[PDB]
């Protein structure tokens, strides 16, 4: 019966309705987010604020030229690259290599981690016969800076758990590991978040870019704040980039009304339970798993796969986030959806496929909408801080979710636009943002 297939589909929709957020829900999240950003900037409230609004010491009024080395650590892969900076300043990726980080190095000791990093740097300097450049470190974790070249790791995020790194100077850890190996020498001149790197890389082609955003494994944003509002740094003149660390929004209960069973389960099986909760609604580290967990509930309610979940479907992380993009790239014939579930040991019908799509759309739309509330909060804050009825601003964006998901981008922009009246927001995707941004920040600091 088509009548019974449609009754299965109606029941799924009732369950999936839970992922909906009304426009007023988003405005509420936005206001709460703006409130947390206020708190993180102020001396009185900074320690308790879950959105830490960390000074980066990358300023509005900041350079050198020549060969630069860029390091990038934040995802499953560590990337090294040679970049040429020339006359403002252009930058170009000329040599590049990425390395897979062994499990033991992400979850072992800091020494292991940075030993592996240094090994990677020497292989790269080998593969290009260049083993003393100025070195920029894109390091995508919450860091409390004392300057551009010095700051301590507040805490690991995104599954990182190397011991002996939290509360230590990250540049120091890198310098130490390089010294231990002692077969090359590098001038470590700057450390930057990936958001900051992305923002800076978009500046040569568009000077209106004063916001950087990452929607990848993790989710975070930075922006050019007025120095007068950055209470943690001395001076009131011009602007300084702030790393919001908005992923930890929710860690003090601010999203509790909105968290679902699937979110609690994802948080509980994560490396950092109770932390990075806003990020866990959005990031690619967690999105596919969120979908896997919806699909499991649906098989349990007898609405999917004849009520039977395969060994693969019951394994953690098996529904990869790229599968969410692929499913939602489907043209209507169900071929992409079928092949994904086939490789998961499942024997999907035609309606099974349509339900999996609906599950993915519900998770990724919520991610798009939740993300939109955070960005709209930042851009609205900036408009009010500045002196204009209409703010024109560019946002530099990187990450596989924003970049590769076929509809996230579009759902996200629309929602951001609803929430930012009297703002004209241009979105640009960075091209090698982290390498070129890191190199560009190095060249300034190279003084």
Ligand X SMILES: OC[C@H]1O[C@@H](O)[C@H](O)[C@@H](O)[C@@H]1O
Ligand Y SMILES: Nc1ncnc2c1ncn2[C@@H]1O[C@H](COP(=O)(O)OP(=O)(O)NP(=O)(O)O)[C@@H](O)[C@H]1O
- Residues binding ligand Y (CB under 6 A): 74-75, 140, 158, 194, 214, 216-218, 284-285, 320-322, 325, 398-401, 404-405
Q: Does 195 bind ligand X (CB under 6 A)?
A: yes
> How far is Cα 254 from Cα 250, in angstroms, rounded to an integer?
4
Q: Residue 354 catalytic? A: no
74 known member of a binding site: yes
* 6-13 contacts, C-beta under 8 A, 24 or more apart: 8/303, 8/351, 8/355, 9/351, 9/354, 9/355, 11/301, 11/303, 12/298, 12/303, 12/304, 12/355, 12/358, 12/359, 13/358
402 known member of a binding site: yes
380 known member of a binding site: no
**Alpha helices (runs of H) in 73-153, residue ranges in sequence order:** 103-107, 110-126
Kindly indicate which of the ranges 19-27, 110-118, 135-143, 295-303 contains the residues binding ligand X, using the contact rule CB under 6 A: 135-143
Q: Does 415 bind ligand X (CB under 6 A)?
A: no
- Interior/surface letters 338-375, b for 16+ CB within 10 angstroms, e for the rest: bebbeebebebbebbbbbbbbbbbbbbbbbbbbbbbbb
> How far is Cα 120 from Cα 122, in angstroms, rounded to an integer?
6
Q: Which does 230 bind (CB under 5 to 8 A by kind): ligand X, ligand Y, K ion, none?
A: K ion
Residue from 141, 203, 402, 408 in contact with ligand X (CB under 6 A): 141
> How far is Cα 117 from Cα 137, in angstroms, rounded to an integer?
11
* Conformation bin of residue 376: beta by default, left when phi > 0, alpha when psi is -120 to 50: alpha
The string of DSSP codes covering 176-209 is HHHHHH-S---EEEEEE-HHHHHHHHTTTT-TTE
Q: What angle do CA 366, 370, 258 make, to 5 degrees?
A: 75
157 known member of a binding site: yes
Residue 168: phi, psi to the nearest 5? Answer: -115, 155
Q: Residue 127 catalytic? A: no
Binding site for K ion (CB under 5 A): 227, 230
**Which CB, 52 or 411, lies closer to ligand X?**
52
- Between 57 and 76, how does the x/- string for binding to ligand X read (CB under 6 A)? -----------------x--
Report the nearest approach of Mg ion to the CB of residue 14 (Å). 38
433 known member of a binding site: no
**Strand-pair partners of 136:** 70, 190
DSSP state of 121: H
Tell me the residue nearest to ligand Y as measured from the CB: 216
Report the nearest approach of ligand Y to the CB of residue 261 (Å). 22
| C-beta of residue 302 within 8 angstroms of C-beta of residue 7 | no
Report the nearest approach of K ion to the CB of residue 247 (Å). 24
Q: Does 247 bind Mg ion (CB under 5 A)?
A: no
Q: Select which of 115, 194, 330, 398 is catalytic.
A: 194
Interface positions, 277-306, toward ligand X (CB under 6 A): 279
243 known member of a binding site: no
| C-beta of residue 33 within 8 angstroms of C-beta of residue 249 | yes
Report the nearest approach of ligand X to the CB of residue 78 (Å). 13
Kindly list the residues in this chain that would bind Mg ion in the complex (CB under 5 A).
74, 140, 194
Kindly list the residues in this chain that would bind ligand X in the complex (CB under 6 A).
74, 140-142, 157-158, 193-195, 214, 216, 218, 220, 245, 247, 276, 279
* Catalytically active residues, by annotation: 158, 194
**Known binding site: residues?**
72-77, 140-141, 157-158, 193-194, 217, 220, 245, 279, 284-285, 321-325, 400-404
**Known binding site for substrate: residues?**
140-141, 157-158, 193-194, 220, 245, 279
């Amino acid at each position: 019966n088509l009548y019974f297939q449609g009754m299965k589909k109606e029941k799924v929709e009732q369950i999936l309705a839970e992922f909906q957020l009304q426009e007023e829900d988003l405005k509420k999240v936005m206001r709460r987010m703006q409130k947390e950003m206020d708190r993180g900037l102020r001396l009185e409230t900074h320690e308790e604020a879950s959105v830490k609004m960390l000074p980066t010491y990358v300023r509005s009024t900041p350079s050198e030229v020549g060969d630069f080395l860029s390091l990038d650590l934040g995802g499953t892969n560590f990337r090294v690259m040679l970049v040429k900076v020339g006359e403002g300043q252009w930058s170009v990726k000329t040599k590049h290599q990425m390395y897979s980080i062994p499990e033991d190095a992400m979850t072992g000791t800091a020494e292991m981690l940075f030993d592996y990093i240094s090994e990677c740097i020497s292989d790269f300097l080998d593969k290009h016969q260049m083993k003393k450049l100025p070195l920029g470190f894109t390091f995508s974790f919450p860091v409390r800076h004392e300057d551009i070249d010095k700051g301590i790791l507040l805490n690991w995020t995104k599954g990182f758990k190397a011991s002996g790194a939290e509360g230590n100077n990250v540049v120091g850890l890198l310098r130490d590991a390089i010294k231990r190996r002692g077969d090359f020498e590098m001038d470590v001149v700057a450390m930057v978040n990936d958001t900051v790197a992305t923002m800076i890389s978009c500046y040569y082609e568009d000077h209106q870019c004063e916001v950087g955003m990452i929607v990848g494994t993790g989710c975070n944003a930075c922006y050019m704040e007025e120095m007068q509002n950055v209470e943690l740094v001395e001076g009131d003149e011009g602007r300084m980039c702030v790393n919001t660390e908005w992923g930890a929004f929710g860690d003090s209960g601010e999203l509790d009304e909105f968290l679902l069973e699937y979110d609690r389960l994802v948080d509980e099986s994560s490396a950092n339970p109770g932390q990075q909760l806003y990020e866990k609604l959005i990031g690619g580290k967690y999105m596919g798993e969120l979908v896997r967990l919806v699909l499991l509930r649906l098989v349990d309610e007898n609405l999917l796969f004849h009520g039977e979940a395969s060994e693969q479907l019951r394994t953690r992380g098996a529904f990869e986030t790229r599968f969410v993009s692929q499913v939602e790239s489907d043209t209507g014939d169900r071929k992409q959806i079928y092949n994904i579930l086939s490789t998961l040991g499942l024997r999907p019908s035609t309606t099974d496929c349509d339900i999996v799509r609906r599950a993915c759309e519900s998770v990724s739309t919520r991610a798009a909408h939740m993300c939109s509330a955070g960005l709209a909060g930042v851009i609205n804050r900036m408009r009010e801080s500045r002196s204009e009825d209409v703010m024109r601003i560019t946002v530099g964006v990187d990450g596989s979710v924003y970049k590769l998901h076929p509809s996230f981008k579009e759902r996200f922009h629309a929602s951001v636009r609803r929430l930012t009246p009297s703002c004209e927001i241009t979105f640009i995707e960075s091209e090698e943002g982290s390498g070129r941004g890191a190199a560009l920040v190095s060249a300034v600091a190279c003084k």
